[PDB]
Amino acid sequence: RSRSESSIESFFARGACVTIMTVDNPASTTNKDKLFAVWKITYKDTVQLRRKLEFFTYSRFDMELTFVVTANFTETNNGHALNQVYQIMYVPPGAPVPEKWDDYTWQTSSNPSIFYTYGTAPARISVPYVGISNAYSHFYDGFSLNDFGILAVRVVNDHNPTKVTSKIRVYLKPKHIRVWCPRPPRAVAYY
Amino acid sequence: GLPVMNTPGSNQYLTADNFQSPCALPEFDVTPPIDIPGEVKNMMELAEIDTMIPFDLSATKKNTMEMYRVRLSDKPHTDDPILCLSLSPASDPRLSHTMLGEILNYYTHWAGSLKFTFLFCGSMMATGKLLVSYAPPGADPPKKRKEAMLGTHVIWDIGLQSSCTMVVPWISNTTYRQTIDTEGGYISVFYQTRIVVPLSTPREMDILGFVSACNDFSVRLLRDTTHI
Amino acid sequence: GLPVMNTPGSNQYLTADNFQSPCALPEFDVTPPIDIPGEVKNMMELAEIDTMIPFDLSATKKNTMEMYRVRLSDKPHTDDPILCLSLSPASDPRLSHTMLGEILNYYTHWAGSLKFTFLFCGSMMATGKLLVSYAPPGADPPKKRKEAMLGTHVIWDIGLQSSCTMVVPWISNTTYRQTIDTEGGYISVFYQTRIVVPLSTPREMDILGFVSACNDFSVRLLRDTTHI
Amino acid sequence: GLPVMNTPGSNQYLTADNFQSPCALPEFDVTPPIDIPGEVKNMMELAEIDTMIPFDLSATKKNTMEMYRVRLSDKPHTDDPILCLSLSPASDPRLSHTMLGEILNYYTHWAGSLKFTFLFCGSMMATGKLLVSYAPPGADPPKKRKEAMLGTHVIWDIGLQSSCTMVVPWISNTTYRQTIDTEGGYISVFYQTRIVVPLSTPREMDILGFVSACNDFSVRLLRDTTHI
């Protein structure tokens, strides 16, 4: 007998990808507003984590985010580019989100930012519990969802000759989980 | 400085890794927790809960309220069972959908005892006897009341007690079974006596059925198969 | 050497990181500090200071000396209030510009009590009664003196004491409010009695208004929105 | 942080390295072990087992049951030996295939004593004498019974005891020999007396032969030569 692997920590704290944020190099050819990528942290997209969390009503958890950046030249053209640096900015709840590539939010002291140098160990931060409430509500029978923050991403190098696309996989691992008030689990139907 | 020697495994991200990591909000005073009722410390606490078995998964009955009710009627006293429930909690479509089954689908291995609980939802007046049998693993399920009686069984008296909690044991060659494919036993309910009723009381009653893991139950080797 | 294994997070610069770092001037003898008067150990010490509320933010009054003075006059005894001040210290344009508001704009969350302090700047001779009311959050502000009196209030006597320090309480569902959007209460000042004056003394006095955080006040989750 | 200085040998994978490594299944509760009979803690425990020598590796005899039996017959009393077995356990085709030899092929160096055990598989009635000789290393094997008798030997009596366990000693200039090329000695069995039998009992008996390492045996410097 042993019930360790069916503990909440073991059942939940498992590195799961939750998004793939794509950003292009600031190439001066015809580039759109794809120069930066923004994703509001939410578990309602990945079915695995969501279906596991909706076993329970309330919750609390730190949130370890790992970032796996993978780039490649777009054109078959004789591509050359020095090592790119990526600004991975975490925007806490209630804070403003970037609108442009050169918005002020990328220079704000509040917003913590990682400067990942390409071709190195995957970047990582550990967001704490950022809830106004004393527990993340997965279901709320009231009138006026919970804010974890936003992740914005850009390339720092600016006047680049050759285009370079890059995908940032975000491996979210909830850590120090607590969950209350179990519920019936949803079918996989409406996901 | 301190001479080091970077070993293999350096600069790899193993998604199962457990290291310290730098906090992005290190000056932030976390909202303290409160004592909410109902903290779950373990998933098996949800499988230890008596949840209702869907017995009739036919085309019409399924995905309604009728898929759970087993109807006892008055018809020719056939020796065949009222219900025969295979004990493949993961690889049985009926137990697969229970809470137990929902937790077992998240795991590969499991071991322990199950407790089944049938519940007569008929009249206070009606009386009779059902025979709740348990064929162990390897056995071909009982086809007649006699074959079932000779083995393990419980003569449940509809008249006296309205429920019947039979507990299955943990019999397996390995220390743990699988959640997919191969036996595991059979609960099965027969009439010992056709149900008696007084006056114009309805002669069509219902029995419900519940299942839950026991305190000895355990799972291991998480396996999430959820996708789109 | 000591075998190590570089983990994820290596060679990243997190602007929130807190590590040791090599000093560029390691042989340099720093100018020692002196005991200057007025060391601030915390920003809330600046929000605990009674600063003056601008009540009249009209086109003319604003960005002058008149935007702070509330003029009491002699006109038909209308039940409407002299002033009604919403308790959105961050999301109220009047309290937004106070020192308290300037410190709250740097933060997301806050919690605590406020103390408002009205101050009669009229004559030593003039006498009368104002009624300083406090509608709690959720309440629609009082429109008549009666509605205000029935709730929480203070009958301030212009003749006896020249100030009136009403302290708001900390009422919120969360442990902390937001600095942007939704209620929070209303201070509001009515005439109980039209102000009496002796001889040709002017019948147009002024009251000032101050606000400050209390010792129980606290903020968290810094949010600088300063840019060009 | 702690200033380090990555030395030579960093980021190399030496297949002989022994470092810690991150577990891919860190939350997984391993199936506990049981007490199975027959745990082997060392490979020499398999070389300490008396396994049967194939003496006749001729074209026909080999890869059958006859390659192990040494046939004693009744023919002209030639002084030549019944068998002469060179003590190159690795570099002798006969001892090479024994369990001892199978373990020695996995190693470069070895040292210790061997015990050979011949076994008469004839009649309870038959009687006679064999002479089991041991020429030490460097010696040219004995060609006549006299030359063998003068050296080390054992006059085995077929009539009394049915086996004969002669133990070779550890004689080598180095502390360890090689498993390939050069001497090491010779066991050799002669007739002292042609085997007597009573009545029509068959005059063609068989002796088997076993070999095993002793408790003093040891190997070192693993050398796997297995390929396709």
Coordinates of C-alpha atoms in Angstrom, one line a residue, chain D residues 61-228:
Chain D
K61 CA 31.5 -36.4 -31.2
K62 CA 31.3 -32.6 -30.9
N63 CA 28.0 -31.0 -30.3
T64 CA 26.4 -34.2 -29.0
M65 CA 26.3 -36.2 -25.8
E66 CA 29.4 -38.2 -26.7
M67 CA 31.9 -35.3 -26.6
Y68 CA 32.1 -35.5 -22.8
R69 CA 32.5 -39.2 -22.2
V70 CA 36.0 -40.7 -22.1
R71 CA 35.7 -44.4 -23.0
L72 CA 37.9 -46.9 -21.1
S73 CA 38.2 -50.1 -23.0
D74 CA 40.3 -53.3 -23.1
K75 CA 43.1 -53.0 -25.7
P76 CA 46.9 -53.4 -25.7
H77 CA 48.3 -51.8 -22.6
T78 CA 49.8 -48.7 -24.2
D79 CA 51.6 -46.3 -21.9
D80 CA 50.0 -43.3 -23.6
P81 CA 47.4 -41.5 -21.5
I82 CA 43.7 -41.9 -21.6
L83 CA 43.4 -38.2 -21.7
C84 CA 45.8 -35.2 -21.4
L85 CA 44.1 -31.9 -20.6
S86 CA 46.1 -28.7 -20.9
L87 CA 45.5 -26.1 -18.2
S88 CA 44.8 -23.2 -20.4
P89 CA 41.2 -22.7 -19.2
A90 CA 40.7 -19.9 -21.7
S91 CA 43.2 -21.0 -24.4
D92 CA 42.3 -24.7 -24.4
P93 CA 39.3 -25.6 -26.6
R94 CA 38.0 -28.2 -24.1
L95 CA 38.0 -26.1 -21.0
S96 CA 37.2 -22.9 -23.0
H97 CA 33.5 -24.0 -23.4
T98 CA 32.9 -24.8 -19.7
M99 CA 31.1 -22.3 -17.5
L100 CA 34.5 -21.3 -16.1
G101 CA 35.7 -20.7 -19.6
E102 CA 32.5 -18.7 -20.4
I103 CA 33.2 -16.4 -17.5
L104 CA 36.9 -16.2 -18.4
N105 CA 36.1 -15.1 -21.9
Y106 CA 34.5 -12.0 -20.3
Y107 CA 37.8 -11.1 -18.6
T108 CA 41.5 -10.5 -19.4
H109 CA 43.3 -11.5 -16.2
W110 CA 42.7 -14.4 -13.8
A111 CA 44.4 -16.1 -10.9
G112 CA 43.6 -19.0 -8.7
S113 CA 43.3 -22.7 -8.3
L114 CA 41.2 -25.2 -10.3
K115 CA 39.7 -28.4 -9.1
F116 CA 39.2 -31.2 -11.6
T117 CA 36.9 -34.1 -10.7
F118 CA 36.9 -37.3 -12.7
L119 CA 33.9 -39.6 -12.2
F120 CA 33.8 -43.3 -13.1
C121 CA 30.4 -44.1 -14.7
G122 CA 31.0 -47.9 -15.1
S123 CA 29.8 -50.9 -13.2
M124 CA 29.6 -51.4 -9.5
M125 CA 31.5 -54.6 -10.1
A126 CA 34.4 -53.4 -12.2
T127 CA 37.8 -52.8 -10.5
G128 CA 41.1 -51.3 -11.5
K129 CA 43.5 -48.4 -11.0
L130 CA 43.9 -45.2 -12.9
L131 CA 46.7 -42.8 -12.3
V132 CA 45.7 -39.1 -12.4
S133 CA 48.8 -37.0 -12.9
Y134 CA 49.4 -33.3 -12.9
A135 CA 52.4 -31.9 -14.7
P136 CA 53.2 -28.3 -13.6
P137 CA 53.6 -25.4 -15.9
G138 CA 56.7 -25.4 -18.1
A139 CA 56.8 -29.2 -18.1
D140 CA 56.3 -31.2 -21.3
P141 CA 53.4 -33.5 -20.6
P142 CA 54.2 -37.1 -19.4
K143 CA 54.2 -39.6 -22.2
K144 CA 54.6 -42.8 -20.1
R145 CA 53.0 -43.9 -16.9
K146 CA 56.4 -44.0 -15.1
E147 CA 57.2 -40.3 -16.0
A148 CA 53.7 -39.4 -14.7
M149 CA 54.0 -41.4 -11.5
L150 CA 57.3 -39.9 -10.5
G151 CA 55.8 -36.4 -10.6
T152 CA 52.6 -35.4 -8.8
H153 CA 49.9 -38.0 -9.1
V154 CA 47.0 -39.8 -7.4
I155 CA 46.4 -43.5 -7.8
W156 CA 42.7 -43.5 -8.2
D157 CA 41.1 -46.9 -7.4
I158 CA 38.1 -47.6 -9.6
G159 CA 37.0 -50.3 -7.3
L160 CA 36.7 -48.3 -4.0
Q161 CA 36.0 -44.6 -4.7
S162 CA 34.1 -43.6 -7.9
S163 CA 35.5 -40.0 -8.1
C164 CA 38.8 -38.3 -7.8
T165 CA 39.1 -34.6 -7.0
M166 CA 42.6 -33.3 -7.8
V167 CA 43.2 -29.6 -7.1
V168 CA 45.6 -27.7 -9.3
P169 CA 47.7 -25.0 -7.5
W170 CA 48.2 -21.3 -8.5
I171 CA 51.7 -21.1 -10.0
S172 CA 52.5 -18.0 -12.1
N173 CA 55.3 -15.5 -12.4
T174 CA 52.8 -12.6 -12.6
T175 CA 50.1 -12.2 -10.0
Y176 CA 47.7 -12.9 -12.8
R177 CA 47.7 -14.9 -16.1
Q178 CA 46.1 -13.9 -19.4
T179 CA 43.0 -15.4 -20.9
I180 CA 44.8 -15.7 -24.3
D181 CA 48.4 -16.3 -25.4
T182 CA 52.5 -20.0 -22.6
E183 CA 51.9 -23.1 -20.5
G184 CA 49.9 -23.8 -17.3
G185 CA 50.2 -27.6 -16.8
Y186 CA 48.5 -30.8 -17.8
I187 CA 46.1 -33.2 -16.1
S188 CA 46.6 -36.6 -17.5
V189 CA 45.0 -40.0 -16.8
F190 CA 46.8 -43.3 -17.4
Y191 CA 45.9 -46.9 -16.7
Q192 CA 47.9 -48.3 -13.9
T193 CA 46.0 -51.5 -14.4
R194 CA 43.7 -52.6 -17.2
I195 CA 40.2 -52.6 -15.8
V196 CA 39.0 -55.9 -14.4
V197 CA 35.4 -57.0 -14.7
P198 CA 33.5 -60.0 -13.5
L199 CA 31.3 -62.1 -15.9
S200 CA 29.8 -60.8 -19.2
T201 CA 29.6 -57.2 -17.8
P202 CA 30.6 -54.8 -20.6
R203 CA 34.3 -54.1 -20.9
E204 CA 33.7 -50.5 -22.2
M205 CA 33.1 -48.0 -19.4
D206 CA 33.1 -44.2 -19.3
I207 CA 34.6 -41.6 -17.1
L208 CA 33.3 -38.0 -17.0
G209 CA 35.3 -35.0 -16.0
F210 CA 34.3 -31.8 -14.2
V211 CA 36.1 -28.5 -13.6
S212 CA 35.5 -25.6 -11.3
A213 CA 37.2 -22.6 -9.9
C214 CA 38.1 -22.6 -6.2
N215 CA 37.4 -20.1 -3.5
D216 CA 40.8 -18.5 -4.2
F217 CA 39.9 -17.7 -7.9
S218 CA 39.5 -14.2 -9.1
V219 CA 39.3 -12.4 -12.5
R220 CA 39.8 -8.8 -13.5
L221 CA 39.7 -6.3 -16.4
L222 CA 36.5 -7.1 -18.2
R223 CA 36.8 -7.7 -21.9
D224 CA 33.6 -8.5 -23.8
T225 CA 34.4 -9.9 -27.3
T226 CA 30.8 -10.6 -28.2
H227 CA 29.7 -9.4 -31.6
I228 CA 28.2 -10.5 -34.9

